[PDB]
Ligand binder design. Sequence first.
Ligand SMILES: COc1cccc(/C(C)=N/C(C)(C)N[C@H](SC[C@H](NC(=O)CC[C@H](N)C(=O)O)C(=O)NCC(=O)O)c2cc(Br)ccc2O)c1
Ligand SMILES: COc1cccc(/C(C)=N/C(C)(C)N[C@H](SC[C@H](NC(=O)CC[C@H](N)C(=O)O)C(=O)NCC(=O)O)c2cc(Br)ccc2O)c1
Lengths: 223, 218
Amino acid sequence: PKPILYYDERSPPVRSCLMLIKLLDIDVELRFVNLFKGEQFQKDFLALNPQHSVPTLVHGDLVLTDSHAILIHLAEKFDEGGSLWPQEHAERMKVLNLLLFECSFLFRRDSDFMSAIVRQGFANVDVAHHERKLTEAYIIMERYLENSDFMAGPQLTLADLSIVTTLSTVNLMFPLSQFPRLRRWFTAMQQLDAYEANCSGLEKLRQTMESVGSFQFPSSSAV
Amino acid sequence: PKPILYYDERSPPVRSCLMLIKLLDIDVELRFVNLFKGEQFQKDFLALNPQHSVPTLVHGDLVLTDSHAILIHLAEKFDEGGSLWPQEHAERMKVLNLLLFECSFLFRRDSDFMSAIVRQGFANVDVAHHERKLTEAYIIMERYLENSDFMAGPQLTLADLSIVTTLSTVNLMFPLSQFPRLRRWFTAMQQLDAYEANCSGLEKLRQTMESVGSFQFP
Ligand SMILES: COc1cccc(/C(C)=N/C(C)(C)N[C@H](SC[C@H](NC(=O)CC[C@H](N)C(=O)O)C(=O)NCC(=O)O)c2cc(Br)ccc2O)c1
Ligand SMILES: COc1cccc(/C(C)=N/C(C)(C)N[C@H](SC[C@H](NC(=O)CC[C@H](N)C(=O)O)C(=O)NCC(=O)O)c2cc(Br)ccc2O)c1
């Protein structure tokens, strides 16, 4: 059975999976769940994923409800012995470590900021607070890129796919001027053919956020 | 060489690693990082882990900065052929999925609640809001337990070790009376010899929290 991805491309974790699907030319059925319309709370989708989150992958009997598991699963099944999810144990653990950084730190903080915008309105959000928290993530990624060419090593891995989508979303608001490593890496990610899978959903998220939060992102920020 | 675990046993993710270490009899060198005194911001430790978080594992040249990676790494190196980290791909993905639920949902929401107690003060916390967020996590785990005795299937896996420590920390504040599968599971987890590794740090956190928060857990 061919994988089924429940998705809203405005979601950075969704876009990470879309990038991997494009990069590996995986044939996957797409099923749209409109998060703006609360379609993730439809009875059928909650029964499938009680966390009411996208991406959700159904591949045969396997139901994955987190992008980082989806990325790893798809790499193991369609990039057998590949380098995106490296064979050597220490290299693989480094990728896993940064995938969890995306869960625990980067996405958590960007999610906190974006949800404040919609619940409070942009003009009411404590931007300085979220700028500090998210600049802290910039600093950490800059430190990783100071010791490594890509996020998890010399070479493109799942960690870059996971991180770049959320990065590009943070960078809608907060400029990367003071982070030369992260600018260089981001530019390199944007040269990848697979980055087209991030472009469209990022722009749709921008259009949605500027309507719901009623504001305009600083256009100069985005790389 | 021997793995080194930087730790503060008040941390639920730390206790998950401590439980695995006891379950697998892993010889590790423990190094205490006092989070209450901000030692995670010490220059040498930030250099090691820019996320300034525990648990952090140093095993040779490998530096792991997240409990879920540490659990997987330790299982792979010290429990090859075990049931905690299943070799079969579908079973392994199901464990991984629940480890990420712990990062993405359970711990995130408990962290939000716990940080609000020490920031605003317990008397100033929107208890109802966090009770709603954390009860939702209870509901989800109750559903995960519908078909199985453990979170990821019929046998104990890394998902149970990761989740039980945060759950016991949530359970300081919200009982499991309404969730029969979850209460059954939590009680079964407490019968494990390895659960002793969770006892000390949970109580140390309770004492620290009841002191800074100026309240009592029921
Ligand atoms: C208050 O609600 C809200 C409004 C606007 C934006 C957000 C928000 C958190 N936005 C961000 C930018 C982070 N994008 C989210 S991504 C979609 C959510 N997916 C996950 O949380 C999966 C995480 C998991 N660890 C993984 O890696 O897969 C999601 O599905 N939310 C649905 C839900 O929780 O009910 C986002 C975008 C949109 Br257009 C709408 C909602 C979002 O949360 C939050
Ligand atoms: C800030 O003061 C304070 C006092 C008491 C309790 C908290 C608090 C928010 N506590 C909770 C219960 C959430 N426990 C944290 S756990 C330790 C932290 N580790 C991680 O966040 C790792 C998550 C990662 N995904 C993983 O799985 O490994 C931590 O290291 N924080 C340090 C930091 O961010 O600088 C906690 C406990 C204590 Br005793 C103190 C601080 C905490 O955040 C907060």
